[model samples]
Target chain A: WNAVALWAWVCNHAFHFHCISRWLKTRQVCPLDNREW
Target chain B: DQIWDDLRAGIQQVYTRQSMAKSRYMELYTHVYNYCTSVGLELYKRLKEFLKNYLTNLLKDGEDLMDESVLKFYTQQWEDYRFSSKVLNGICAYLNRHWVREIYSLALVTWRDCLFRPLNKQVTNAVLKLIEKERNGETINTRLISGVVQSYVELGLGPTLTVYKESFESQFLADTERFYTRESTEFLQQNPVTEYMKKAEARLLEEQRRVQVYLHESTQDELARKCEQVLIEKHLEIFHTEFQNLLDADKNEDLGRMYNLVSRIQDGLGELKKLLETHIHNQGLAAIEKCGEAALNDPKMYVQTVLDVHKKYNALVMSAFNNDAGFVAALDKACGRFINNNAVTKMAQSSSKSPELLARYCDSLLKKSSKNPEEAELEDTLNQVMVVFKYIEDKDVFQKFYAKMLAKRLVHQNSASDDAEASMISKLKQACGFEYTSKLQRMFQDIGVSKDLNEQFKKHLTNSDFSIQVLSSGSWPFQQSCTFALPSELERSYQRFTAFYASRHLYQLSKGELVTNCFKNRYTLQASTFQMAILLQYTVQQLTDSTQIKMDILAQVLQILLKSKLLVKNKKLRVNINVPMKTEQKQEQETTHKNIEEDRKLLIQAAIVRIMKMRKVLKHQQLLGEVLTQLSSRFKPRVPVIKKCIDILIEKEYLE
Candidate 1:
């Protein structure tokens, strides 16, 4: 049932590039771990 | 699965029922956020698939509805979807800011790609069809259509107006063109020119207002241009033809309307100007044809008719045509054409003498024949004369006649006003240059000088009722030198002035052309020197009423007067003591001929002497040419007259 796929490696948490780039301008951290990508 | 179902139900409730609790919606959004962090890519995939399926179902449900109902339902659904998206984007802020923001613009794109893209063709067609319906005079809901079209603009991927342009405005403009093309053709055929213009103006304003309503504001200029192209540009020929009839008929209001219409299009008034020129030219020709004979017989009526025609057309150009420069220039050209037409001049054509008749017209105005005349009317008549004078080609001919008539008026004191005569000279000076008026001004000056000379001469005499007009010979028109004996009273003053003039100014009086008025017994006749010499014999004899002088003695005493027709032969061979009135007619003809000869001789001699005084010496041919050029305005002197005048000038020491 898992549709998860490795998009970009961000602090060892796989995330879509769109998701990370969208956060990069403002957050500069992973939404999953709250640490620097 | 649980989180996806919860989020799905929450979105569905927000769109379908509008009954979602804030806390509950936030709970669903938090679940999606948590799922996006934990199961990252899976959460984004589910959200995209769920929104896509949801919008697809919404469109499918409304697919079978009528276009109007579908538009109403779609507009309502789109509004709810916008509200629902706003709530979902806020509650799922974390997921959108991180995961959903880049690949998609949230719910808008999902709805567009899944629903609007497929349904846009059908939906915009429905909106356009409704516009067509409204355009065809069916009253569908305009507010609903505006909202639907507005939705298409808003539903584009972002802020781009591609949907509005592609879906609506392009079709709108095409249909507008077709509609106006048909409507303008019908209106132009059905209505008269002014009424057509009224409807065209109304249509333009209505289209402009349409731009403010459902149509975009940018279409205003293009719509107006299209209307002008169809209504005015295409039918310009018809308009011009109608314009001619209107002008001829003096339908001023319609002409004003036509002017307003054609003035807007490029080169529109150019067409109008050409037609106006033609119309005026035709009317002028008709007027000349109608009045040419009458005008020739009665110059006063002729000039008055011409002025009336001028006033009528001038007022038309002013009030109806807005005093347009092109129209005014056309009017002047037409007036010039008619005024100088050989047809009009033929009646006065002893010498192509429109100039003479025009001068005579001025004389009629300035002479005492005008009854209780207003000064303003005199100014107006003179100004009008100048207007017609602009059209005459041989202005010199006019000057010749004007100088002749003006001399008569001043000498006889028959002119209505001195100021009017001076003002007329000023007008002539303005039209034809100063050299043309210089001799005329000298004539007036001569009159003034003679007045002063007479005043001094009267001072010398105690109580003599003697007055003389010491006129300048060259400035006055043709009068043969008549040698007449001065009465005793006038002889004293005449001899005194001759001596006084010579002594005071040191000017010799050898060639002075003196015209003396001998005031005697009761009658003050203008007698030539020959006639006066003949008449002096009457004083010498005791010719009472019964007394008849011998024909042989009278002819011998007054041979020159008899030759000039001042004295006639009688059937009884007695002196024709009656002095029949028939002699006056014969004298007039004789004077005219003698005037031509005498005036030519005098003017030619003066011209030759003047040339020699300035140029000192010249060949005979050159001198003749100079004299010809000098006296060309007065008359065409014969060759014999030229040679004789030069011979007289040489013998008199005026020329070598």
Candidate 2:
């Protein structure tokens, strides 16, 4: 939804970092598919 | 004098105490302790009295010793005194007194000349002497000098450093390929890839060249070309922002205050702009100088950030042109600097054209030519040259400039050979063509006549007309931009010129087969010959983005028909498309079937062309949408259907 998510995507793609700490901080994906929470 | 001696003696006792304390004997320890306790106290009390007397004398003298140079303080030496522990203790027994606060203040002032000043003077003098010697070309031992410098640096100033290496492959590919062509990878695959992209590349270039020629020719009316004038005004507006504060004050109640304040602000802004611009310029130059400074330097990364911002500012300036004169004026003042530095007057004097300038001024430009700002400036100049060409309408002038440019470019490209010279000529010819091919033919002939270009020239003139007719009748495979994609009178003119030339060439070359195999294709290779037709057809269409170009299916059928006519035209056989119904009923029926087949073939070809063209339009729309989306990501501005249709196209492509 914001710059954090953008960075998460970029970091994961570019650096291939798998730090659980970063993942926990950044992961905010919605799970309802098309439906809003 | 007694007090000064006592003060010096007490300081000396501290020194003696330190030296004595280092002794291992019990007597030495007792003596050091007794001296510090007794002699130091008696000495301090007497020294306090001496300091009071000295201050009174100093006030009378009216000299500030505190302000004196450390060198002066250190070089003027003083005497010292020592203490025997027993005798000192006896003297301190009577003179001992407490004045902690007063002594602390006096001690601080007195400490400067004795301890601090001398230390400061020693270090500074040493460093300067070293630096001065080095600067004056003294051959100091490298290692010793480095060691001294490093130690001083560590003790004096601190340094922090970081390293970076950016891969240029990605950046370079993006720079060269982005907005170059749509699906360039795919397009490269489909085409013969024989520098045909150069032709497609030149289409935009031709448009740019035309604009430059137009502008240059119309130089007398340059400022009046409202569109360009607006850009100048925009820059002037940028310049005005440098002095925005003067206009911003609510009222001029205090002229002096306002003037001073505005002057200060202008000075500050001038400094800031100079700093930032030098940084920006340095960043760009550094990148060019060393490579990839943009990616490496954090400050330079902001250039990309600023570009989006600049677009917004540029847009705001444009809007301000109509809405607010103050803003416009402010910006104009700021940008005046850029304008005075960059405008046509200065740029035009160079008499060289730049591809970059053409790119900026004209819609499409040759990427190969527009490498840097200087080249762009040259492009601007080149356009002016074309304008000169237009006014004089002198072929000689055009040829002179054209040949000069080609020669210059050859040297610039480091290409010096007959082949390269000829290649450049062909390249220029393709980019810029004569308005009338007939006139072009005459010019070529005139040149040939003057230069004795030999029979080849005459041969080309005669064969060109027949060849063009054969192509037009769909007897040849070559696609004419005007005829294949869009039929026009211009295309017809092209056909007529080529037809006339072909007839003239054939008439002249009627003697025998060409004198050499190099000229073999001139006579023996007919337009209807399948392989030759295909190659020529592709080459012609490849020369320009002929909106009329179609798929090979139609071109193949057209070649088949042209061959039949070509045979008849050669008087090898006699036949007609129109046959009577009675004389040979079977033959007539066969003709009808053939006619039906041809019509069906044409219909299919038309449908394929229409569908592909629609798809191409849709792809273009998609590309436009992507560009708009990128643009809007910053400014959030909008353009019409061109953007929307592209978005839709992307959606369809993605199945989203």
Candidate 3:
């Protein structure tokens, strides 16, 4: 629960920036407007 | 023995305004010098006694004369006697020194006792009445008065004046108060305040001159002060009451006179200027009262009315009121208020009307019809509108409407000035910044590129007869294109032009066709793209039904073409479709306005994010305030819209 992160602007889903890069297994786009990067 | 008689007779001759031989004059002096060494003390007393009797007799001659020219007689009597005293003093110089006293002081004392004490009293009255007569428009000789009053000053008998001050000055000053008191009171009772102001102005002017001419120099300031007190200071309370009336009547000199009089007392012009400032402000308020629909739609009448009122008062303040900072600054305050909030703003029910109409006013000047109407006038008109421009609160709306009109104006060739168009944009650019004019200026950039674009097209397809105008799809703000992207055979020729222009800019295709009759589609050549698309269906097949249109989506365009006589079958044949249906270009004006909200939201959101980044923390309302304060220059943001931007940014994680 104490895991800290920064996230997408449109939806307030926070994840740490460097950690999000490691989790980029699928699409390269912010989750809010999810069409393409 | 012979000395006293000779000296006295020669003194009589000098006193009579007569001249004698200089050698004889020296003889009289030497005779006095010879006798004075041998006990001339009794002789000095005898000469002093002789002068008083001579002057007493001289003055008595005027008692038999009429009082009217009696002033005239007195001045002459004194003038001659003055000359006589100087000469007598010279002749008695040695006898004078034997007593350790000059005969000059004796001459003054003798004259003072014999006639001048009573002379100052009578002459003060005569000079007073004579000046009153001059004030009443009779021109008496100022020389006579100057001489008579200066005699009182000369009769001081010492360096200071008791005779001048006690005899003449107190009575002179006190009498002036009484005089102007009755005059100003009587004038005010008989005439209007403005009418009496002229008299006060003139009388005030003449009082200063009276001091200059006849009144003793010692009486100068006090005389003017007393007159100001009676004529103007007494009248001051009434001045402010009547000042508004003068302001109401456009009395230029009267206002100036009032300003002059009122400026003397402590902060005298304070209440008076406040009244003027109020009148100017209210007058400006009424000048804008016609901000009804006429002002709303008709930019020329509204803006020109404001300009007229502005110009009129500006000159009034400068020309009449001496253009004091207080006056001119008050004028600016009223001017700015009336411009920003007026009948139009209230009636049209938005803050939008003020900036909207003003932008239209500038549009009318920049439009083609007015450019032939003198180049300098066009330049000056543009300059003045900018002055009005600064007062409007919604600069964003002006930027909103201006660029679209500029786009429309640019697309049409009918507009007159080339240098003037770009010049107007640069003027706006200076007022705001590059971001304000970003897309509109880029639209111009796109046109100039397209000029070379079409020129490049001419080189590639030297004789193709049909040509493509490659408008950058993103650059121009017009919309729509699913069918535009989907056509297969359409892709062939577009690809040629696209390949040639090369490198990677997408486009909007407005295409053309040639038909069997040629004249019909030749008229259809410049038909609107939708008109050309439906009409091109006929090149594939001739007898197209109204049912050939969209199942339901294709109703209006198909119905318009039939009635527009493009597709025929108004119970007939032969469609007259050609060179664009010139039923006039229209639409999506509301949509374009809707488009502004999209930009507005982002800006408000961006405004919030920037503020949040700057401050360590702020509550909802304070952040609301900082957001509004930050972006207040371009447009005022609504609270709900700004609140959404804040929360929207919160969700975006730009701010917590």
Candidate 4:
């Protein structure tokens, strides 16, 4: 849940790593960047 | 937007330093607290930007003040900001614990980066310049320096001291270098050397209190050395040149001060060390000059003057030089050079003059005939002579003369006190080591040996109108046997003397000549032969010497007189048990060089054999080395001396 580890570069989108790592398993793309693969 | 408006309005009042008239601690605490729990993510960014913008305006307000005037506002602003942060930290306790726990750190970071980074250079100088002004004998507020360091230190910046050291301390020392570097040379050239030393001393101390009082303790260590190098090292030549004048005028105050400062320059101490040595020797040389022409012949005069010079410099060396080992060694060499090489020692027709005179000086002090200095003074004077004694190179020369003198003291019973004699001998033993003075010790024991022997002789047969001193011939240095006629008037005491001892043979007596002096009983010390001559004369109101009786004949005459005691013949009287038969006194007497040469070979031969036995096998170099090192304390054995002895050891067939 470290905000320190869950930030996207340039976009500055911050989230809990618990949510982000789960999101990464669902799909490998920037959590908030709509155009990323 | 309404909740944001209320939050922003509350922070504005606090930041502007207004009292919170409408706000309650509880109302503010929970309102900001409850709102942050739900919308903290939305608010955190707004709050960060808000604080950043607010502090930036404050720095803009600060830019107008600049340098020293600006720091008061900057520190006072931070003081208020820190106070405000504390209240904010409490009111938004829910926000503080989570969102702004990291948030509060950012707020302080925001303040540092936004306001402090730009202002640090100016504020640090303000404090440093205040310190400089303080150093110029002016007073300034110390808390301003303390407050500024805490602002940086308390920031919890990249690391704790990172900002404090880089921002403040670095410039403090930078100023430290330029200030001391500029001032010390200027001050020193303008002031007298002592006054310069006094100022340097005062400044060094003030720097200590300043570091502990207003700066980081870690900063103190580097600051001290910088101050030292600039203030002390830069001015070193001044002290080195003036050191002699200081000693010449007896400026013990300036001397201790110069040494204190110069000692910090490690190489500087060495220069002063040589200066002191040169000074000490010149003074001692001049002292000898003042003693005038006949000083060489007067052992007391020569030694006492050397003693006074050594004593004076010794206190100076200890008190001022702090007794540096290297400096003390220099003191010794200087004393040694003058003592062993001067006009006195230069006239060494027989032996080095210093040690010989020193021995006689000791003899004069220990003998009953010398000046009767107070008992306390004599002991102190005896100790003083030894300080000069250690400087002699050939201690053996002293030993020869001292043994001769000590023999006279014991044999003539002219020794002032036995304890003083023993005390003098122990001192020689301490300086030259035990072997160097071991024979001297034996001489003392012989006196005791003779003393108790006479006591036992007295107790054994109840007397010594015929008593004798039984000195160990080996222990004492004198010898020569002479022959004389029988005075039968002495015949009775002589045979009676022989009759008692021949029965049991307490035969190893030193000299009979001293015994007649013994019967006068003022002194119990003298030669055995002299006593017998006196004894023969005693039967007819004896006078003394030019004496000899054959050794065996004397023993036989002793037997006849007691039997004739003429046994009931009133050949009458006390049996003479005191005379030792001459036979036992015939100890081997080799000529001087003969025994030394013989013992040189024998003692070294024994030493080499022992070293080889311990090692069983050794390199030829190692064996020689071990043998030489082993024997060096007792004798100065040579490589050739060792080789000759080693060769004999092999020739003897015991060592392979």
Candidate 5:
């Protein structure tokens, strides 16, 4: 994945912005680390 | 100069600064055009990144704002960004027009991925909250809401409404469903149908008006339907219950409202139709029970009451149900169930009989000296009977009674208007078929022939008060003929007609020759020839006694009078005349009259056997139908009676 993409800064994950933003409302913890971002 | 940095500076002036002059706007378009053409794919990639960062910074500035203020900023930024994006699109048309499939709509993708992709949730949540406040009756800025909704719509780009629908419209619909679901249940608990319907109509209108002002036009009908589903359709069972109360109270305006509102949903009219049927049936059945005994005494009143019930519900179906075919069918079925199922209606009156009651009703109408003489009223009355007739299952029974009454009216020359009678028959023929009225038509034919016979007879006699009804025996319900002596005056006219009848026909040559010799030998009387011979003896004796004959001869002559009840002779043979009474003779006559009923059953059984023998195979219903069809002109054959007749015929093997 590209670190310079908008997704890298928004969620610090490899997931796309559309996908990561969908979970942000209900889940505050990051999916890969299972910890608060 | 660095082309990417230069283009970014110029686009920022057009969007955020909003200070781009007409020359400056065109200069930025040329700059973007030169960068995409000279620098190729490299410049396009750098421009997409710059646009994304610009939108990301815009949402960042609104992170801590209130929902409405955030929506306001989002709307303005969307409009300014769209303005700049259009200018960029005009400059970069070559790149977009030839771009790869995934990136063909590069400008739209920049808005969606940069602004909406990161900020869609915030924008939707804000819009929904404002909508919720509006639903709760607080005035929010509709223009601001409309602008944000338009941003979502525009983000969809090129022929697709996906983003707007998914972002805002769907959530709006779901929230509406929830709001109305709770609100309608509460309204139903607190309000009557009239109030609930009013509230429901108001909610629908508000949704439509919202679509007109703030929401997309495409969502107008969709939102209305969802609202209707929760507000009205979900509460239909209670609506149906209240609808009956409205109908019973004759609330015309409320029913008209009920029809209009329910007709909006699928199968809503169908559900209302069923409720109408059950309500009419229950009301009609109750009416029949209330008037049961009273109707027993006066069946015409029962018939009239039944007619009244039918008329009331018929108008309700027409006016309230809007004359829907299904509702009208329910009306017919309910009327049929109550009118025919009542005991008093099916029971017999004095000689009037129940089925015959309808016939008597017709008789009152067609009588020349009818109590009512208005022609228009008669037509309307017959049409009313047809309404009753439509619901009657034993239509054949009505035909039977009508034929019997028609016979009397024709024979007595009592029918007031032949046209009225013919019109009624035509109505029957139209309702049923030609076969149903074929026998009725035959009755009319008999009257026509009788009229001609009377005219012919009148011509032969320069004038005579005498008239005879020449009827076909099978066509008319006539009894077995009995012989009676005519006085000499009538006897002469009878002989004259017989002679005239015998002489005119082509087949009369042989019969006339034989009759001429017998007529010369003796004058024939209508009575038994033996009875005529005896009366002739008495006539000769009466002539001789008046001429001063001996007492022995006179006494012998008076003996014949005692035997015939013309005189009474005591034990000493002294003569006296009193109101003649022969007790034993009357008793004999009474027993014979009782046997006539038994003989009639035998007659029907024989007819049944004859029919079955010819037909060979028939269902029970069919057999009964045929039996009634054959026997109805004379009398209405009961089902049980016909059953018993079939049993006897089967037992005797006449109907094997």
Candidate 6:
């Protein structure tokens, strides 16, 4: 299933925290962390 | 620009009474303004005259007891005169030297009487307060003079003359008719063309009566045309000389003198028109000699000639100035036809009639272009001598003329920006002078010119900057405790700090290019002009001075914000007004915890505006000071928090 989060996952790989924190209210904060990945 | 400068020069000399001898004369003149009943002015005048005589008599008879007593009273009289003259001269000096703008403002309002009486009293009191402070026995409260001067001006001229103008005009004005009648008359005389048309129209009607009864219907047209030709012939000689004089006066930048000349020429035009009417009326009286003779019934040749001649001179008065061959050819033909075959006699035959025939003759004026370029050049040069004055204050008129010219494509194609902006700035300077340039800049800033241009133009502020300068120069506790809250855009700009700090150092100590007095905010504009902002700064400064405590705290917060490096040097401060626009407030939503961030910003800006407004209130009325003190007392809890912020800033080396 193609979802908005799928596009976000591809774009935010390098700086996922920047994108997740900016729109924390509108969308769920992504779970991609540098140490846990 | 030249016109306004001339007006200012004349007004400067008149109001400044630049010489002490002249100051006495000006005081004597304004005694009429100071007193109500002519009885008072007359009594004052008589006292002045009697005092002069008493001095002379005492000088002549030095040893007589009666003369000695009279001389004592005369000496007392001289003291009163000297003191009164100082009061008057101080008022005039305020008007001419320091507040030279008041006269232009007074001119705007038609020069109302009693406008300056209160201002005179305020200035007298201000100077006396200074004198009193200087004579203080021990404790030196230097800032007291500034506060007293600020309060006197804010309470007196700032609010009194500016805000309650209706009351001043209706209640205070007395015997203004004498001043304005002369002024308005003089104003009209200098600008002849506008007035000349009305006079010419009236003369044409009065002269037409003579043409109707004298000529047969066939000859009446030709006769009426002949009459118009005669008037034009007379006016051309006068217009040439008068036009040249106005041009010269304008060139000399003597607008007031030029205005006087224009007024005289207009009056002269009216007189010449009346002469034409008398001649035409006489011709009508003569035509009665042969009326109803049955010989005056011919109408065939008269109408055609009348129409032709009407086409000729009507063009002279109404049509645009042109020198084209076709127009010249038409004018030549019309003039020749009217002059040939005793055209005057033909017109005289039908003595008294309406000159609808004359109106029709104006179509024969010369065209603007020519086959020969030299002829066109002459026409162009002559046309350049005449200009249409667009009143800058009448923005509607400016817009209307701009639209008309743009539609016609009549303006220069190459498009030089220098002349237009230069003309505007020159006019601005003329209207407000240097003292009010900051106020003018603020007004333009509010209107939102391009951002880049605004930054380039306004490197220094007139009011707040001057206050900071006074702070830097004068040793007063109040100075160290207050700082101005400028627009965030201005404050945030790194480049601005250099100019601000540099000028901050030089502001009252050096008369460097743009430096001005901080107390100028206390100077109330007594006159009405777009330039009245200089005096308006008095109110603005008073408000700023009182609210500065709040601004100081805010400045400390800003200083910390600067040091944290969270505010990138390149990042701009964005302003957002929290209050919903009248249009947007229709949809109300429930307040929620989620909107906390937005509310915090809104609350801060709103508080700042409220503080500013409160300060404005304090300046407007001293009674509001009670309310302000109460509000400040309520906010006393915030002082410790602000103190802590400042302490932190100082520790961070950002307070400096």
Each candidate structure's TM-score, on Cα atoms with residue i matched to residue i, is 0.66, 0.21, 0.72, 0.70, 0.68, 0.14
Candidate 4 residue-wise lDDT, B263-332, digit = tens:
7655677677778788888887777777766787787788778888888888987887778789789988
Q: What do the candidate models score in CA lDDT, each in turn?
A: 0.63, 0.33, 0.65, 0.64, 0.62, 0.33
lDDT of 2 by residue, B1-656 (tens): 13333324443454233433324334333443445542334546555666555434433443333332332332222111112333334333433343242333343345333333235435345434543454345754433333322222222113411100011112322332332334344555586433332433343344345334322222223222332222223223333443343323322322222222223222323433343343334333433334233322232232233233334444644542233454444443433332222222233342112211221222112224334223334344334333322222113223433332332232222233334234334444554555423333443344334334235445776786222101111211112231232134224433433323245351101111111233323334222222232333334335234433345534544444444433222334332332222334445335543454444344333333334453554444454444544333111222443345435535545322
True contacts kept of 1: 0.00
Q: Which candidate number maximizes DockQ?
A: 6
- Per prediction, the TM-score for chain B is 0.69, 0.22, 0.74, 0.74, 0.71, 0.14
Alpha-carbon shift of residue B229 in model 4 (angstroms)? 2.4
lDDT, residue B480, model 2: 27
How many steric clashes between backbone atoms does each model show? 5, 51, 10, 27, 1, 44
TM-score leader: 3
- The DockQ value obtained for model 5 is 0.00
- Candidate ranking under TM-score, highest first, comes to 3, 4, 5, 1, 2, 6
CAPRI band for model 1? incorrect
Supply the TM-score of chain A against the true chain A for every candidate structure: 0.37, 0.25, 0.29, 0.37, 0.35, 0.24
Candidate 1 structure, TM-score to reference: 0.66
Q: Write out the backbone clash pairs for model 5.
A: B368-B416
Q: Identify the runs in model 1 with alpha carbons over 4 angstroms from their true place.
A: A1-37, B1-51, B67-71, B74-142, B155-161, B184-194, B346-352, B391-393, B463-466, B474-480, B487-502, B505-656
Residue runs of model 3 more than 4 Å from their true location after superposition:
A1-37, B1-6, B35-66, B92-102, B114-116, B157-166, B185-288, B369-376, B411-414, B429-446, B463-493, B504-529, B537-656
lDDT (tens digit, per residue) of candidate 3 on B125-194: 6778887888789777788878777777787643788766776777777877787777777678878887
Candidate 2 CAPRI classification by DockQ: incorrect
- lDDT, candidate 3, residue B526? 39
Q: Which lDDT tens digits does candidate 1 get at residues B1-656?
A: 45556765676776664556655455665675566543345666667888878777777887776566667777777667777777667666775566532333656567567344556666766776776776667786567666676665665663787755676767767766787787767666776666887777776666677678875565567668766886788888777667766666757887887788778888777766767777777776677678767777577877787888898888888998888888888889888766666467765434435655787788877787446545767888888878877766556556666666676667644567767777888877877767767777777677677668667655756555235545535334544432334456335534654435445441111111223434332333333333443344354334322224345534444554455544452244223222324554446545554454554566566566667778866567676677667765444667876676667656756655
User: Which segments of candidate 5 are over 4 A away from where they belong?
Assistant: A1-37, B16-41, B60-63, B97-107, B113-122, B129-141, B156-162, B217-222, B263-274, B345-354, B370-372, B432-438, B452-474, B480-656
- Tens digits of per-residue lDDT for model 5 on B455-527? 6766766664245555545445544422334445335644564523335331000000011222224332221
